[PDB]
Design a protein around this ligand. Structure first.
Ligand SMILES: CCCCCCCCCO[C@@H]1O[C@H](CO)[C@@H](O)[C@H](O)[C@H]1O
Length: 414
């Protein structure tokens, strides 16, 4: 009961934030698609990614071990809004370096929130429902992403100045400066809305009183240490395996979506990349639908069994995708996300549940494996080009899902 209301709030707050955030995702390109283009500095943007999803996690966890989950969530929510707030001004004065800075900051909020919010929800109540809790909250996440794209993308990209790069090319310098500014001007109000949303969320959390948790506690001082927590983590095996599992999931997932439109265009005559995007959309819908249903499953059933089931089906879909072509392989690929759905939350929960003190530090690592999303692309490109076509590369995701299934039948403990 006292575990329940905070939870429902977290869900709504997951949803809400999920809107403010993917809202930020729609607009950020515009800064870039307007001030096009550049070479070296582009790599600097990708670095925010590793920064936030590799560096910040462990420190974040340390913050948490020493303070708590709410502390980490708060600062994470704090980091995000600060970083998001930097954009508008960097734009309005055309200071890139400032933009880049806010980007790293918002990037840290992300790694911070990831490492914070996930273990928190699964611990937010009885041990069994840890998996269902995280999954359901993640559904509200997915759902929030749904909404922004819907009620938001249309009702917000119809106020931003469209421009054929050719017109931009033909502009005088004065004109270009004028354009760029009118552009950053149109987005700056929705950004205030965003930050506003992010803030209120942070607010509600401070207002919200949660019950205590054997994993937030401090009864240790020496053994509460990093390496103490760490040396203990090696055997645990299910944790060490979920780590490997999440690396693969992220690799798998980005392999699928990142290469999807290329697959479509090279596989189906005559696809425009414009039209292919439609399939990409369907994928996110499968993903949300996939999660809703999977969570209904996670409530009825042993999570690992659902995880294992889903891992197999997705791997199937991918083999089908790799060996089929035309529309048959496409649909299989785009339908695959319906089964990726449950995977990340379920992997995460099986992974920690249950680590107690080491829950925090264990999470820091699971988060870092998001680096796998980055490591896969070269391999996708490599295998793809080495083979002459996109589909044979789709064996790689499949290879991931396979591994993940092994974990599912290897999630066990005690
Ligand atoms: C009131 C508390 C609000 C806390 C919200 C924590 C959100 C954690 C969600 O994980 C993130 O979701 C993104 C999509 O929304 C993904 O793209 C990204 O990979 C992942 O890192």
């Amino acid at each position: 009961r006292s575990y329940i209301i905070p939870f429902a709030l977290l869900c709504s707050l997951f949803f809400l934030w999920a809107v403010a955030n993917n809202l930020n995702d729609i607009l950020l390109p515009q800064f870039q698609q307007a001030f096009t283009l550049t070479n070296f500095q582009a790599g600097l943007i990708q670095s925010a990614f590793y920064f936030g999803y590799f560096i910040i996690p462990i420190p974040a966890g340390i913050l948490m071990k020493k303070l708590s989950y709410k502390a980490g969530i708060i600062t994470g929510l704090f980091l995000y809004a600060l970083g998001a707030a930097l954009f508008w001004p960097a734009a309005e004065i055309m200071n890139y370096t400032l933009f880049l800075v806010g980007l790293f900051i918002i990037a840290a909020g992300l790694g911070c929130l990831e490492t914070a919010a996930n273990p928190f929800v699964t611990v937010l109540g009885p041990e069994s429902s840890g998996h269902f809790r995280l999954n359901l909250a993640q559904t509200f996440n997915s759902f929030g992403a749904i909404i922004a794209v819907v009620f938001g993308q249309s009702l917000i990209l119809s106020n931003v100045p469209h421009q054929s790069q050719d017109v931009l090319d033909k502009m005088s310098p004065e004109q270009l400066s004028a354009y760029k500014h009118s552009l950053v001007l149109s987005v700056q109000t929705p950004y205030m809305i965003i930050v506003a949303i992010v803030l209120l969320v942070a607010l509600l959390i401070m207002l919200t009183k949660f019950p205590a948790l054997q994993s937030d506690n401090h009864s240790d001082a020496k053994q509460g240490s990093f390496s103490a927590s760490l040396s203990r983590l090696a055997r645990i095996r299910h944790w060490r395996w979920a780590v490997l599992a999440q690396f693969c999931y992220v690799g798998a997932q980005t392999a699928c979506w990142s290469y999807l439109i290329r697959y479509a265009v090279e596989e189906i005559p005559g696809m425009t990349a414009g039209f292919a995007a439609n399939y990409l959309t369907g994928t996110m819908v499968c993903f949300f639908i996939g999660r809703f249903t999977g969570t209904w499953l996670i409530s009825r059933f042993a999570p690992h069994k659902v995880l294992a089931a889903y891992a197999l089906i997705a791997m199937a879909l991918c083999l089908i995708s790799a060996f089929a072509g035309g529309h048959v392989g496409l649909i299989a690929l785009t339908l695959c996300s319906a089964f990726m759905s449950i995977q990340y939350p379920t992997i995460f929960s099986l992974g920690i549940k249950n680590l107690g003190q080491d829950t925090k530090y264990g999470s820091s690592f699971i988060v870092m494996t998001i680096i796998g999303g980055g490591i896969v692309t070269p391999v996708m490109g490599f295998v793809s080009d080495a083979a002459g076509n996109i589909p044979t590369a789709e064996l790689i995701p499949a290879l991931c899902f396979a591994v993940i299934f092994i974990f599912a039948r290897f999630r066990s403990q005690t």
